[PDB]
Amino acid sequence: VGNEIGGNLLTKVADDASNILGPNCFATTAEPENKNVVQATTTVNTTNLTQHPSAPTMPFSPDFSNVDNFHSMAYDITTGDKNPSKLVRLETHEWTPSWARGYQITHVELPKVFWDHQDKPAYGQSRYFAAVRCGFHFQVQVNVNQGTAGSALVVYEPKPVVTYDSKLEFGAFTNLPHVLMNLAETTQADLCIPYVADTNYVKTDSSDLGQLKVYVWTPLSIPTGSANQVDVTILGSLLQLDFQNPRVFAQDVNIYD
Amino acid sequence: TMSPNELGLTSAQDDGPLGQEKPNYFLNFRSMNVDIFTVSHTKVDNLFGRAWFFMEHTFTNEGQWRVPLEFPKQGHGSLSLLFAYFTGELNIHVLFLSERGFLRVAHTYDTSNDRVNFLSSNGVITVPAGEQMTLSAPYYSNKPLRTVRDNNSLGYLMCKPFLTGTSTGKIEVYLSLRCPNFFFPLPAPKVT
Amino acid sequence: GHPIGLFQIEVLNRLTYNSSSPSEVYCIVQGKMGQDARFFCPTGSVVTFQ
Amino acid sequence: GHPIGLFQIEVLNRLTYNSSSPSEVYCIVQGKMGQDARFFCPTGSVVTFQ
Numbered sequence: 001v002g003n004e005i006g007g008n009l010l011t012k013v014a015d016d017a018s019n020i021l022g023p024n025c026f027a028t029t030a031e032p033e034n035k036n037v038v039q040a041t042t043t044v045n046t047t048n049l050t051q052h053p054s055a056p057t058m059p060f061s062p063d064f065s066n067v068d069n070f071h072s073m074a075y076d077i078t079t080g081d082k083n084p085s086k087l088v089r090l091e092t093h094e095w096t097p098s099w100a101r102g103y104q105i106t107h108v109e110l111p112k113v114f115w116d117h118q119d120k121p122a123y124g125q126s127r128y129f130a131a132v133r134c135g136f137h138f139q140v141q142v143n144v145n146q147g148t149a150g151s152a153l154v155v156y157e158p159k160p161v162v163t164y165d166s167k168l169e170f171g172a173f174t175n176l177p178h179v180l181m182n183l184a185e186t187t188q189a190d191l192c193i194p195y196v197a198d199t200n201y202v203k204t205d206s207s208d209l210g211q212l213k214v215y216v217w218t219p220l221s222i223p224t225g226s227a228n229q230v231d232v233t234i235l236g237s238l239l240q241l242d243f244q245n246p247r248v249f250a251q252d253v254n255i256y257d
Numbered sequence: 258t259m260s261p262n263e264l265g266l267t268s269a270q271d272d273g274p275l276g277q278e279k280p281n282y283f284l285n286f287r288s289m290n291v292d293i294f295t296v297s298h299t300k301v302d303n304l305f306g307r308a309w310f311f312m313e314h315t316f317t318n319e320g321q322w323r324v325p326l327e328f329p330k331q332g333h334g335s336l337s338l339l340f341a342y343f344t345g346e347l348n349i350h351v352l353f354l355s356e357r358g359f360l361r362v363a364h365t366y367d368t369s370n371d372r373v374n375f376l377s378s379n380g381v382i383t384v385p386a387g388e389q390m391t392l393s394a395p396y397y398s399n400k401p402l403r404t405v406r407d408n409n410s411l412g413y414l415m416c417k418p419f420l421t422g423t424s425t426g427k428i429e430v431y432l433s434l435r436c437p438n439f440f441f442p443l444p445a446p447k448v449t
Numbered sequence: 450g451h452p453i454g455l456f457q458i459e460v461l462n463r464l465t466y467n468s469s470s471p472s473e474v475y476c477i478v479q480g481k482m483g484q485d486a487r488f489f490c491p492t493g494s495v496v497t498f499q
Numbered sequence: 500g501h502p503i504g505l506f507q508i509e510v511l512n513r514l515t516y517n518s519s520s521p522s523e524v525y526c527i528v529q530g531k532m533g534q535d536a537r538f539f540c541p542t543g544s545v546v547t548f549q
Contacts, residue, residue, distance in 0.1 A: 011258075026284055030260050033268040057273020059441060070401065257500040278484060288485045298489050307491065330498040333491040338498060446498035469517035 004029060045246060084122035085238040087139070088114065090212075092233045095142075095152070097220045102170045105152060105214040105232050109207040110136070114236060122238070129243030130253035131201040137237040138191040138212055142183060147226040150183040151217035158196050158210035170215070180217055183230075192239065201244065203255045212236075301437050308350050308433035309334045315427040319418055323373060326364075326411035326432065330446065334432075337439065338446045342402040346435035347394045347411055355386040355426035359419040364394035366403075366412035373415050381415075386426075393435060402440070 010027030018024070039053035067077070076082075090113050093106035111134060115126040126132075140154040155178035161168065174180065179189035195202075195209070202208040214232055222228050247253045263280055280288060297303060309332035314322050326347075328337045337343070353360040363379035365372060373379065384390045394412065403410050416428055458476075466472050508526075516522050 024284075026259070028259050028261050028264065030262070033262065033271045055271035055273050057275060059274075060276045062274075072401075254501055280484060288483060290485045290487075292487070293489060297487075298491065299487065304491060331494055333494070335494070335498055449497045449499050469519055 084125050085241050086121045087137075087235055087237040088120060088122075090114070090116065090138075090234045090236045092231055093214075095216070095220060095230045095232055097222050097228055097230075099216050099219055101216055101218060103216040105216060106234065107211050107213040108234055108236075110211045111202065111209040112205045112207060114238065115205065122241070125243055126204055127250045128247070129245055130204050130247040130251075131243065131245035131255050132204045132209075133195050133201050133242040133244070134209075135195055135239035136191070136193040136212075137239050138189075138193065139235040139237075140179070140181075140189045140191070140212075140214060141187060141233045141235065142181070142189075142230065143187050144183045144220075144230050145226055146184055148184060148220060148222045148230075150220040150230075152181055152183070152232065153215040153217045154179045154181060154189045154191065154212070155215070156191060156193050156210065156212050159208050160198075160210075162207070162211055173215070183220070194239075199256065201255055203253065204243070204245075205250070205252070301439060302435075304333065304336065305434050305437050307333070308348065308431040311430040311432045313427055313429045314416065315425075316416075316418055316420075317425040319420055321373070321376070321415060321417040322428070323370070323413050323415050324430075325409040326414050327408055328405050328410050329432075335446070337405055337437075339442050340405050340439035341443045342440040343405045343410065343434075344396055344398070344402050344438045346396065348391060348433040348435055349394060349414060350389070350391045350431035350433065351384060351416070352389040352429045352431075353384045353386055353418070353426070354428065355418065355420070356424045357421050358386045358424060360384045360386075360428065361415070361417045361419065362390070362392060363415040364392070364412055365415070366396075366398040366400075368409070368413075373413070376415060376417055379415065381417075386424075405439070 007027045007029035010025065011023075014023040014025040014027070033055075037053065038049070038051045040050075041048040090108045091106050095105050099105075111132060114120055115123040117123065138154075138156075140152075142152060144150065153173060155173050155176045157165070157173075157176060161176065177191055177193055179191060181189045191212070193212075197208060197210075199208070212234060214234070220230060245253065245255060259282055263282055265281065267279075282288075309329055311326070311329070312324065314324070316322065326349075328343075329335055330338060347364070349362070349364060351360070351362055361376055361381040361383065363373070363376050363381045365379050367373075380392070380394075382390055382392050398412065411432070414430070418428075464472070464474065514522070514524065
């Protein structure tokens with residue numbers, strides 16, 4: 001017993017000798033506000049360990065919902081979050097009428113193209129992560145007046161194909177997710193491509209996810225008066241995105257062996 | 258029973274969150290609440306519900322008068338300086354000291370000077386010469402909250418008088434507010 | 450008006466220390482109203498704030 | 500194979516001390532596998548123990 005026991009004895013002894021007026025003394029013992037404890041706080045991939053914590057403070061009758069009930073910004077609350085998955089212009093090129101069948105019109109490095117310039121919605125985050133796992137939704141657009149005709153082959157080529165491209169027989173590329181799109185009939189092609197690789201994750205700022213290309217199925221048959229400047233545009237959206245490995249700002253990191 | 262914490266022994270670094278109505282005692286002492294009046298004079302609605310002088314303007318002609326309206330660092334209204342943000346109805350008391358005429362009065366929070374050129378759209382209540390009116394301007398503020406300190410914390414007041422002859426005079430102004438919403442109290446002000 | 454009273458803080462036991470501790474420390478005195486505090490009549494001003 | 504990553508221990512707040520305490524201390528870094536650790540294929544040896 002002791003030194004904890006004192007509030008009671010003093011409080012009691014004071015109590016025992018008390019008369020009509022009452023006790024002439026009160027004693028209370030307890031633990032100090034500053035006790036021997038340890039506090040731990042964890043934020044995204046971080047852990048703060050403090051062995052000398054203090055009572056946390058905050059304003060009067062505070063509201064941490066942080067949501068503007070007036071919606072001075074009429075946007076979905078998760079706008080900023082989904083922003084990087086937004087549809088963007090990945091490429092544009094002008095098909096030249098002279099081009100032969102099987103000629104490559106244009107191509108886009110996948111998936112590093114979504115971070116093609118610092119003006120890409122996904123460029124921001126892509127910088128702070130070395131690993132990526134995502135799905136794509138392409139929309140190759142090619143517009144041509146009715147008078148003209150022709151056809152282009154929009155096809156997705158995984159790294160395997162891109163690597164050994166010359167070893168593959170054109171005309172068989174229809175085995176890959178493609179869209180033989182006959183001009184004067186269709187002005188846009190849609191391609192939904194899931195994560196395809198021989199590795200669970202692909203290094204950010206790499207072409208390992210393969211690349212989307214556009215070939216000349218049948219050259220452009222442009223009549224005399226008809227226009228001769230056909231542009232091919234490639235748009236891309238991320239069906240699903242996933243940045244995992246943390247890393248310094250835009251520093252080449254090897255996720256592979 | 259009573260803990261040593263409530264007997265004076267505490268730690269200043271363990272006061273957060275802000276606003277701890279902790280009771281303090283001793284053997285012969287207890288918090289005793291005694292009220293001398295049927296109501297409180299400390300409540301924001303009551304205290305501020307009472308006007309206080311603002312400023313005066315002397316007019317020798319109809320030219321319009323626009324003045325930024327701000328919280329006082331002078332009267333009992335100074336108690337507002339203990340806060341950072343305000344929002345709510347604003348009571349403006351105007352006295353028209355003139356022999357023969359009328360006084361157009363209007364209030365807007367809009368900073369643009371031009372919007373006040375055509376005074377009628379804004380309001381323009383009419384106080385005949387020798388009369389005083391008390392108009393309650395609503396919170397038509399383009400900003401959800403009014404920093405309480407700003408030289409224009411309160412919206413601008415417009416006074417244009419439709420005089421008739423060579424008559425001239427002066428317009429004294431007093432301000433008060435109806436039900437005030439103050440937030441995030443800041444540190445006490447200094448003295449001049 | 451009239452003062453609240455005389456405030457005095459006398460030394461009871463000399464502040465002790467050692468080779469690696471200060472021989473004198475700093476003190477701060479704060480003041481606030483009790484839970485039974487009240488104010489009543491609003492009057493004119495005796496000073497001007499800024 | 501490939502490194503596990505970059506390990507860095509930077510100073511956040513200078514190690515404080517007093518008349519009877521050290522101005523610098525010793526540190527030890529240990530390493531172990533997590534509760535989800537696993538190993539898979541046994542391969543040849545790259546070194547010889549003793």
